[model samples]
Target: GKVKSLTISFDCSNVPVYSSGDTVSGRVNLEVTGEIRVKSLKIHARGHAKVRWTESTQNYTEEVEYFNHKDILIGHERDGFHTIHSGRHEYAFSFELPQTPLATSFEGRHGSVRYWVKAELHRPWLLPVKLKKEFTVFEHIDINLEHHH
Candidate 1:
């Protein structure tokens, strides 16, 4: 009964059109009414592209996951979880995307390439609180001058 609010936020990005060498950054903000038993705070970043459709008799689908990142934002179980006093708290994070190609972000009737970051706060004898934010990705394209497209 001591937790007031839990929030997840991004420093920028709409993911501000992330590309190679770009950093994915964000923070988690939490507020409590008083001292509370906090088990852990965790975040997950995931990106995937999927194409799904139904035929006259069977369903057809394909999916490819680009990346999955899991992080422990606060608290570790050396012996037990930590505690949070009242007021507000903030935790910051950043990640460097891989150099490999990330399929350009898109959405459509039967297919989509999507990305999001999610945060979870866990406590004893209580349900975990969750929040998430979405981001966009842009894949750069180049045509060789020697062999123009």
Candidate 2:
């Protein structure tokens, strides 16, 4: 069996920029042909900060998962195993970003932070199909904090 197309995309793709307390929503599109067996469908959305750099001859890395959300679109076992009847399917998902001060997505020479969303298609007996996409998070610095020097 072969997958024709499996994609993850955001509803706000045209305007991906978002603040800390914004709602992130998107859709998962899956298409397949021929006969195939599958286990389940799972989707994950996450926001994280990571930094990696080499010092001297040593490498260092740190990461923090600030926000995460998961949804099970299809489940096996009690939900029963799934089989492709040659068709296309879509699922909608949404989650709100944390209201707390979150790190903005960044990339730099020393180290950088970032955030992303992911969609997973679980196949217990075979390799799971995974799709990932990245997004930005911004938490502005207080303008009043500056001194009148």
Candidate 3:
């Protein structure tokens, strides 16, 4: 059987690196073997931190959502009809990173913090198509800099 392809690609050449106040941009590519009906095309970006650990018969978890944004690229018409022909298509997207300090991505034994972008194609009759990509965030520290009094 032939299956459709759905992918989310980032414009960044490297491992999609970013810092505070940086702008992240990318594109969503969609392909299908046959005409597919859709309700909308949406993109979402989110950054978060979480700490979880388990103790003797006890589990503890904490999470923080630092940034989250969503954009709708396409939607149904007034007549409530939306479809894509069998072919390849792309849509561009961009988002500005938050100016506030954000925790860098980290993976540990007990917990982890991460950032990711996702594209979703909504369908009324069948399961929605989803694509996701991850990016890394870095927080720089200056040890030699003097503190202002």
Candidate 4:
């Protein structure tokens, strides 16, 4: 019902930096503010990779991009925050790092990708609001290729 401050403290809290084949693990922390009945508290983690394009003219230009959405909640948790009142709760989100690693480029190893966690606090007595947080995944060509290759 009420908007609670659901703090998500991950194992690698600082946007995880990884290559194609790696494992990502973390813990989600939740802090509830007020008391209410919770229906379902859903946590989701996901990532995406996209190819961007642009169309240009003498005076006008347009750009578009195509992307793939993967790992919708590679791992997640559902718990009671509103019903239980203020306290701390945590859950594990361990996703098998992919070799393709969303951010891969045609140029000497380039990747533009994003990773994030979202919390949907459900309640029976009040309105529910979903909270979100995003992180970045990086690739260092010279240093990274040696390990993967």
Across residues 1-149, which tens digit of lDDT does each residue of candidate 1 receive?
47777777777614366865578987888888868887888888988999999989899999999888889888863324688887998889888777788888899988999888899888877787888888788788442246556
| Winner of 1 and 4 under lDDT | 1
lDDT per residue, candidate 3, 45-71, as tens digits?
A: 999988988889899999999999999
**lDDT of prediction 1:** 0.80
- What candidate 3 gets wrong by more than 4 Å, as runs, is 1-3, 53-58, 76-80, 141-149
lDDT (CA) for every model shown?
Answer: 0.80, 0.77, 0.80, 0.52
Between prediction 2 and prediction 3, the one with superior TM-score is 3
Candidate 2 C-alpha lDDT tens digits along 1-149: 77799998778625677766788888888888876667877887877777887898999998888887888877653334777657887778888988788887788876677777787777746778888988877777342335686
Q: What is the TM-score of each candidate against the true structure?
A: 0.82, 0.77, 0.80, 0.57
Name the top TM-score candidate: 1
lDDT of 2: 0.77
Q: Which segments of model 2 are wrong by more than 4 Å?
A: 52-59, 76-79, 141-149
Error in Å for residue 34 of model 3: 4.1
Q: Rank the candidates by TM-score, best first.
A: 1, 3, 2, 4
* C-alpha-based local distance difference test score of model 3: 0.80
**Clash tally, candidates in order:** 2, 0, 0, 2
TM-score of 3: 0.80
